[PDB]
Design a binder for this molecule. Structure first.
Ligand code: NA
Ligand code: NA
Ligand code: NA
Ligand code: NA
Lengths: 251, 251
């Protein structure tokens, strides 16, 4: 599997000038090894990013709606994004599940619609502190992945990447270990193997989407079931390049 | 009060090429009378629209989040929009209240944040069929406006426009009359007068946001408390210009 690093800018930066400065820094970065890099930005910066970002990387949206167009004030749709040449979106990020109240049925509909219309997706999952403490993390994540699975159209698993977010380690006073990352990525791979088969399980990239920084990326990358990262705040910093380059530690 | 016409494209068109064609048609339109025109488009088309739209009109977003930036994957914020020179947003559109489940507390926070950061807002309200049939439309709309009022910072009423949406007439099998539009716009003006005073009530534009087309815009415009329109589907059509030009029938 090719190592995969997604930079999720989230709702940042504040201005188009700052976005352009960030792009200039990314464009001069020396990538080592073999890695697929995707950069996700706010909708209003996607045109800028598509025009100016180095063409060996790809641009991603941070969300999409479930329909092609229509009476959905405020929503951006798959055809609009595709009309700029953008091929990727994030779906189901913890912030959207938890703050914007996106449920599994809505997310499954987004995944199906995006894939059947020629997008590729970074589909996010992960458990909260209660389920982690109860020893039920794998049950919780399995339910999420089992809702995603029937949404994937026939022939579209090549266009799916899954990101695991240790939500129990966000703003809770608890920190995730390297071993926690490996264990949960392996749990997801085994669910795929059991539900859709070994061929698919062996090709799908499974990313760690917890806190990834230059000081932990190399050890995380070396974990056998960790195929890359969905990076948060370091995306906006020169340290993103260190994370991209951690691929050389992943066998 | 200057007559005000907002074109809400909603989640349309599907492609940037179609957006550019629509802009070209708007740029050649001959406006009659005196009218303030704003065009609201999907986030990803806002840069295009800001660059290319006739400078005597203004661009608007269709929504904004409550914070300047941060860990809000998928959201677009006020500073991002302002960094393109865009000064307007719609808030509280029925589609966002009803499909995206935006509540009055969230919307009040958006209105306060947008206004205190130098935006102007088109704040939407309106009752559903049950409240209309119960004879409680004015109570329902008053509760909505009373949640909006304390959000408006001192000195910012010049930057507020209110749109009334007869949600009871959307997809219900019932149609609104011209008299219904006038009556509800007057209800809103009287709430403003009673709660924040006659000076403010006399300056705030109150728009009709139900079905507005070339065949009904002139009679609606003539209603004394109707100060313009938040236009839906006709926004995407040459008939938008007829609606803009209905201002000559409003005294
Ligand atoms: Na257990
Ligand atoms: Na690895
Ligand atoms: Na009554
Ligand atoms: Na009028």
């Amino acid at each position: 599997r090719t190592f995969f690093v997604g930079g999720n800018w989230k709702a940042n930066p504040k201005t188009v000038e700052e976005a352009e400065k960030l792009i200039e820094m990314l464009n001069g970065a020396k990538v080592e090894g073999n890695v697929e890099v995707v950069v996700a930005a706010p909708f209003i910066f996607l045109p800028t990013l598509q025009q100016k970002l180095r063409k060996d990387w790809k641009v991603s949206a941070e969300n999409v709606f479930t329909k092609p167009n229509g009476a959905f004030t405020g929503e951006v749709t798959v055809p609009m994004i595709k009309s700029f040449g953008i091929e990727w979106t994030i779906l189901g990020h913890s912030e959207r599940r938890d703050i914007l109240k996106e449920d599994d049925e809505f997310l499954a509909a987004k995944a199906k619609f995006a894939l059947e219309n020629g997008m590729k997706i970074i589909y996010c999952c992960g458990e909260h502190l209660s389920e982690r403490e109860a020893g039920k993390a794998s049950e919780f994540v399995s339910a999420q992945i089992e809702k995603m699975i029937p949404a994937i159209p026939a022939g579209k698993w090549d266009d799916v990447v899954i990101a695991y977010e240790p939500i129990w380690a966000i703003g809770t006073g608890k920190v995730a270990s390297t071993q926690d990352a490996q264990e949960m990525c392996k749990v997801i791979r085994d669910i795929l193997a059991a539900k859709v088969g070994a061929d698919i399980a062996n090709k799908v990239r499974i990313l760690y989407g917890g806190s990834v920084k230059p000081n932990n990326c190399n050890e995380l990358a070396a974990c056998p079931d960790v195929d890359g990262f969905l990076v948060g705040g370091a995306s906006l910093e020169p340290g993103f390049i260190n994370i991209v380059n951690s691929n050389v530690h992943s066998k």
